[PDB]
Motif scaffolding. Structure first.
Motif, PDB file in Angstrom:
ATOM      1  N   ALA A 128      30.227 -26.684   2.528  1.00  0.00           N
ATOM      2  CA  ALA A 128      30.583 -27.102   3.942  1.00  0.00           C
ATOM      3  C   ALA A 128      29.897 -26.165   4.557  1.00  0.00           C
ATOM      4  O   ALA A 128      29.431 -26.697   6.039  1.00  0.00           O
ATOM      5  N   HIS A 129      29.364 -24.736   4.511  1.00  0.00           N
ATOM      6  CA  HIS A 129      29.099 -23.892   5.076  1.00  0.00           C
ATOM      7  C   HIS A 129      27.678 -23.424   5.328  1.00  0.00           C
ATOM      8  O   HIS A 129      27.402 -22.172   5.383  1.00  0.00           O
ATOM      9  N   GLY A 130      27.284 -24.286   3.883  1.00  0.00           N
ATOM     10  CA  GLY A 130      25.912 -24.063   3.449  1.00  0.00           C
ATOM     11  C   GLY A 130      25.535 -22.590   2.971  1.00  0.00           C
ATOM     12  O   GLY A 130      24.576 -22.222   3.159  1.00  0.00           O
TER      13      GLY A 130
ATOM     14  N   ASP B 113      31.300 -17.698  -0.363  1.00  0.00           N
ATOM     15  CA  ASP B 113      32.095 -16.491  -0.386  1.00  0.00           C
ATOM     16  C   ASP B 113      34.188 -17.826  -0.156  1.00  0.00           C
ATOM     17  O   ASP B 113      34.880 -16.680  -1.040  1.00  0.00           O
ATOM     18  N   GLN B 114      34.007 -18.964  -0.812  1.00  0.00           N
ATOM     19  CA  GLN B 114      35.096 -19.899  -0.776  1.00  0.00           C
ATOM     20  C   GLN B 114      34.560 -20.704  -2.130  1.00  0.00           C
ATOM     21  O   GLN B 114      33.781 -21.298  -2.322  1.00  0.00           O
ATOM     22  N   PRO B 115      36.115 -20.408  -2.779  1.00  0.00           N
ATOM     23  CA  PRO B 115      35.961 -20.992  -4.262  1.00  0.00           C
ATOM     24  C   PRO B 115      35.919 -22.873  -4.090  1.00  0.00           C
ATOM     25  O   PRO B 115      36.419 -23.242  -3.242  1.00  0.00           O
TER      26      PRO B 115
ATOM     27  N   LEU C 208      30.827 -31.830   5.832  1.00  0.00           N
ATOM     28  CA  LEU C 208      30.072 -30.866   6.435  1.00  0.00           C
ATOM     29  C   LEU C 208      30.472 -30.099   7.390  1.00  0.00           C
ATOM     30  O   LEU C 208      31.332 -30.618   9.001  1.00  0.00           O
ATOM     31  N   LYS C 209      30.467 -28.243   7.778  1.00  0.00           N
ATOM     32  CA  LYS C 209      31.032 -28.330   9.185  1.00  0.00           C
ATOM     33  C   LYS C 209      29.874 -27.424   9.814  1.00  0.00           C
ATOM     34  O   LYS C 209      30.005 -26.745  10.595  1.00  0.00           O
ATOM     35  N   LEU C 210      28.955 -27.024   9.633  1.00  0.00           N
ATOM     36  CA  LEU C 210      27.158 -26.929   9.756  1.00  0.00           C
ATOM     37  C   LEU C 210      27.002 -27.631  11.132  1.00  0.00           C
ATOM     38  O   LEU C 210      27.731 -28.667  10.605  1.00  0.00           O
TER      39      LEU C 210
HETATM   40 ZN   LIG Z   1      35.684 -23.321   6.778  1.00  0.00          ZN
END
Ligand SMILES: [Zn+2]
Ligand SMILES: [Zn+2]
Ligand SMILES: [Zn+2]
Ligand SMILES: [Zn+2]
Lengths: 697, 697
Positions: free
Chosen positions: B640-642, B234-236, B22-24
């Protein structure tokens, strides 16, 4: 990857071999009597290899099954129990017909062979007889050295001929077989399938006389001392690693007319499978009553099951990849291509047309031909027709006797009549004779055989019943009567009131005539095959495709890497199975009834120094993208350094249709890991003497 | 991995969330009304999420299936054809009972709830009524603000209580559904299974009045403007990548006595699975002949199928992991550990004994109680009993009315009676009545109900037929007659000669007595459950196990990574399926009959800009090690970015027994990839307007 490469294509595959991971020089692999290749032996329809300086030979359990079954009774069942000889004096004979062939020499004889063929000019039958005579002379000269047997092979439809010369070891003994629940774990349910958990290995030992020359079994014989033998790997085999196999694949049909395929798919495979299943059902029933029949028919049963499942699998694989379609379309695209180039491509287009018509001809009689062949293959009628034919041939000079009936064939003829004792029960064969007569009468009137009609006396249950009652009076049921007739002359056969011998004498004129009709068809084929097949090859090369001959029982090399496959989206089969997977299939009932010692060793994680860390267990079986087929069983799998990492034994289900149309994505070899061999011999059915002999205990 | 974490446990999972990818920030996840968590909504037994600032809501096809079915006819069948509203004016009502609940506030009321319970004293029935009156007062106060609906939750067996307040949107419209052969591709054959190839999504739009406040359906309503909505990744998404889900799982039984497990596995699941499969068989057969029965019963049939199959899967999974044995040993361990603690363990030991006894009291009448409940759940008797009960409750002050029969429940009751028009056919309900009457009669003498026996007036096929013929005279078959009774007073029910009404009047005293008994046992449970379940929790912590409450329909968070699983040795399931997998399953017959535009687009390799190069195709569904259950269908899967990467919809076959005993190795979520939603909406059943609104146009 694809290809059953002849040793003479090594320059073509040297670079691919390196890129796949071979760390031996291509030079070293080229030496067919060197290290490691000189360790690889042919058994006759299976491969094997030497694994000690004292004549120890390892192969598959199902390759040894014949020999195990021959030494088994209802009251001592080696199939069920295994066999271990604590000393070499304890090893039992594998049978008079058992062989180890050790490669001596290969010579191209192409130029001579197509001369002799051409030297007969334009008569089909004469062409066949001339090749026959050329072959017989070659072999007679090559076998003039005592202890060698030679073989002539035709490759690529008769575009190349090579003569192979082998040391023929004729005293083969069983040294070790694990129990049948290891050697054949999962039985016919897991046959032709992955995941696989089958310990398919067994050991022979090869013996010669004290002069060191081949001899038939005697207690004065001693172990053969091979020039070269294989060593077990000392590096653990893992996913992606380089593997190679060398061995003796029997037959493929990747060069074929589309019509050859359609006949096989629509007729040959379905018919044979049905017959094979019907016989299985009959023998199965009778053996559940009768352990003597069960043990005696076990090898036959295994064969019937294995071929019928194989053909079921091929039929399914054709539908999965639309083989009918692909064949049609490469055929269209090859006929296209040929007229294509007008003048130069007319010989090839002519060929297609002859071949095509030859096929319709064998097609006209195919049911007759099959039915009559399998009727005559039952035990007592087979024995009588072979033995009478031999009496006929023995009257000619040896050089003109039919192949299979010359002096050099006498050992195997006599051997087969003795082996039959362990594979014949008269109540059982009666039911098979019945089965095949019932199928004979079923034949249409145009598809019949005059002499069999007469012998039988009418087209009904009554005649069948009469036939069967009469045949029942043969004395050919005992080994001693068979061996009497092995030695008798032709007049003695025509004098006999034995009803089986009377049948033979009755039908032999027809069989010789049909044999001529076959030799004539083959002769016309011998003209048209090589030209057309040479064009299929040339096209394939024009398409960048791989070019190697269909299998023909000669030595081939295949190479690639350890890898699984994906049968359906969302899943993958892994390259290995593990000990835990064996015990997960356990049911306590045949075929999933492993020894107690296995079950306890696994539950305890007793991995015996053989765990592969990467899979967290001892490996059992593994998949790889090698290209093997029937005849490759028992072939040693070698790693990048030429060390033994397993034995080839089977194909996955989706692979089998590759006999006709190769599918790289679903074609895999199934091999037993050498560490499972080791693990079984340490923890389950131990053979500390063989391990120490292989320098792994 | 394991865990249906309550939001208040975020401090405890912050670390593991980070380690999983998780990046948030965890505080950004803690804001339950912020970005992105405030986008997650409850539907009432499913989850959904906002995906535009104009009130666009995405959930599963099977969640919207009730609303698609309610807007379907035999002649114009939206289940079959899909639905697409090209402008917001073309959206159709999802039905009067459709809801979107938007989280407003959570309050801990544990202390006050436990004091309300303690003030009741020793008596079990008073203890239940005291918690009821506590809940009612709390909810009345919280719902004083127009447009809000509140709910009280008990966690961990009554050790914690929280109140949730939600904005209650009551005008939900259908904006898009793919064709059923996309939405439920593979039907009941692929349900609970991987590999899975199901486009299980649909869209609602949420509407409010022009003054911004929730309202029932009206043409004057306008789209709700959510404070937060999700964006498409926007990321696969790839194998191993972090994913998390927030949603509303309904119920788990991971804290249970061994005896509760044993009764469920031995009696509850097999019994219900049988009854559901019997009903399925009748309705299936009748729908074959009658396309109005088929369309009207489709949603009912989908429930029966889904539950019965779930129950088959739990029972198989219990055997696979020996759940019985695990529950027996854990309970022996906990009771050990407690006896271990002297005096201070005694209250949990006594609690355990009391819970066990209360389970026995339930068990004694379980056949009667199940059979009577499901008989009275057929359409006319369920309507008659519900409506009659309502008329009785209406004579009490609102605060004293039974939950489900208060003023706040009137909209749902009314909507139910209307929705039933699209779910009832007399000739079908009659067979279901007959099934349940035949089951009733199989009950033994001590499990019978005097009122039903008297009403039946016999015990044989003839009495059954007379009772059915009598019930067929009801006029409750029509919506208008149901709504008349919805408004009518108790004396009007007691005067009626409607035969379903007469049945309801006859049995009501017995139902009320049975309810008192259940309330009495619940009150005993209120006393013993918290103490035992606290001990279970404390024991788990002393073993260093994860500690989180059983699901109870409130908001939970689960997290982990994209990953497949290994169902058996030699095989793995890969984390993705692909488009080519959907087409490989095609048979042209339900349930494997994809839209022709799907089959064309895949054949043409039209990937629409959505191909993931790592799998060579557009992804369809995927596996991950998240911990979800019934109620989580429709939950958004965040990266990871929600950002939105899919929708939760199912579990794999081996997962389902995790309702009782968590198995980490074989417990996976099945999700539909956001790229497949997009791809369907580009190439197959196009909705450029919605893609634009989600800016992926
Ligand atoms: Zn990232
Ligand atoms: Zn090396
Ligand atoms: Zn004799
Ligand atoms: Zn009325």
């Amino acid at each position: 990857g694809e290809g059953m490469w002849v040793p003479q294509q090594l320059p073509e595959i040297a670079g691919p071999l390196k890129k796949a991971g071979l760390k031996l020089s291509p030079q070293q692999i080229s030496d067919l009597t060197g290290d490691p290749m000189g360790a690889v032996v042919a058994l006759g329809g299976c491969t094997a290899s030497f694994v000690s300086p004292n004549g120890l030979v390892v192969t598959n359990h199902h390759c040894a099954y014949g020999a195990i079954q021959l030494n088994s009774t209802a009251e001592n069942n080696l199939i069920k129990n295994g066999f271990n000889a604590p000393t070499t004096a304890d090893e039992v004979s594998a049978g008079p017909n058992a062989r180890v062939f050790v490669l001596d020499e290969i010579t191209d004889v192409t130029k001579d062979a197509k001369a002799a063929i051409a030297a007969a000019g334009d008569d089909a039958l004469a062409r066949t007889k001339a090749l026959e005579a050329f072959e017989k002379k070659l072999i007679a000269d090559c076998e003039a050295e005592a202890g060698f047997r030679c073989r002539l092979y035709s490759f690529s439809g008769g575009n190349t001929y090579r003569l192979f010369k082998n040391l023929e070891i004729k005293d083969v003994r069983l040294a070790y077989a694990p129990p049948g629940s290891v050697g054949k774990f999962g039985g016919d349910i897991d046959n032709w399938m992955w995941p696989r958990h089958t310990g398919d290995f067994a050991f022979y030992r090869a013996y010669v006389g004290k002069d060191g020359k081949p001899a038939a079994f005697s207690k004065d014989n001693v172990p053969y001392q091979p020039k070269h033998w294989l060593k077990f790997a000392d590096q653990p085999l893992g996913a992606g690693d380089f593997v190679m196999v060398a061995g003796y694949p029997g037959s493929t049909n990747r060069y074929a007319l589309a019509a050859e395929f359609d006949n096989t798919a629509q007729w040959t495979y379905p018919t044979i499978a049905r017959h094979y299943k019907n016989q299985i059902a009959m023998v199965e029933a009778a053996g559940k009553q009768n352990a003597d029949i069960q043990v005696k028919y076990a090898a036959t049963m295994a064969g019937w099951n294995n071929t019928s499942k194989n053909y079921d699998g091929q039929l399914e694989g054709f539908k999965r990849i639309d083989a009918a379609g692909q064949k049609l379309r490469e055929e269209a695209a090859v006929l296209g291509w040929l007229k294509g180039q007008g003048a130069k491509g007319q010989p090839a287009l002519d060929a297609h047309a002859k071949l095509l018509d030859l096929l319709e001809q064998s097609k006209a009689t195919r049911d007759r031909d099959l039915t009559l062949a399998l009727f005559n293959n039952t035990a007592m009628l087979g024995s009588a027709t072979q033995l009478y034919r031999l009496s006929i041939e023995r009257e000619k000079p040896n050089a003109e006797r039919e192949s299979g009936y010359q002096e050099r064939d006498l050992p195997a003829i006599e051997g087969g009549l003795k082996q039959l004792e362990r594979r014949y029960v008269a109540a059982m064969d009666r039911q098979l004779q019945e089965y095949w007569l019932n199928e004979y009468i079923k034949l249409p009137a145009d598809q019949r055989v005059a002499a069999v009609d007469a012998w039988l006396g009418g087209n009904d249950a009554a005649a069948v019943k009469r036939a069967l009652d009469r045949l029942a009076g043969t004395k050919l049921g005992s080994t001693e009567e068979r061996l009497k007739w092995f030695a008798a002359d032709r007049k003695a056969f025509e004098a006999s009131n034995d009803p089986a011998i009377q049948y033979a004498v009755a039908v032999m004129p027809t069989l010789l005539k049909l044999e001529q009709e076959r030799k004539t068809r083959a002769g016309e084929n011998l003209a048209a095959r090589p030209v057309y097949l040479q064009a299929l090859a040339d096209y394939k090369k024009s398409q960048g495709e791989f070019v190697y001959p269909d299998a023909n029982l000669s030595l081939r090399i295949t190479f690639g890497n350890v890898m699984g496959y994906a049968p359906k989206d969302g899943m993958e089969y892994t390259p290995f199975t593990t000990l835990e997977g064996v015990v997960a299939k356990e049911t306590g009932q045949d075929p999933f009834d492993s020894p107690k010692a296995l079950l306890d060793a696994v539950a305890a994680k007793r991995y015996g120094g053989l765990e592969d860390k990467r899979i967290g267990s001892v490996p059992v079986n593994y998949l790889s993208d090698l290209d093997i087929t029937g005849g490759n069983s028992g072939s040693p799998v070698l790693d990048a350094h030429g060390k033994l990492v397993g034995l080839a034994f089977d194909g996955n289900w989706e692979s089998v249709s590759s006999n006709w149309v190769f599918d790289p994505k679903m074609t895999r070899m199934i091999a037993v890991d050498g560490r499972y061999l080791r693990w079984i011999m340490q923890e389950v059915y131990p053979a500390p003497q063989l391990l120490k002999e292989m320098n792994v205990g």
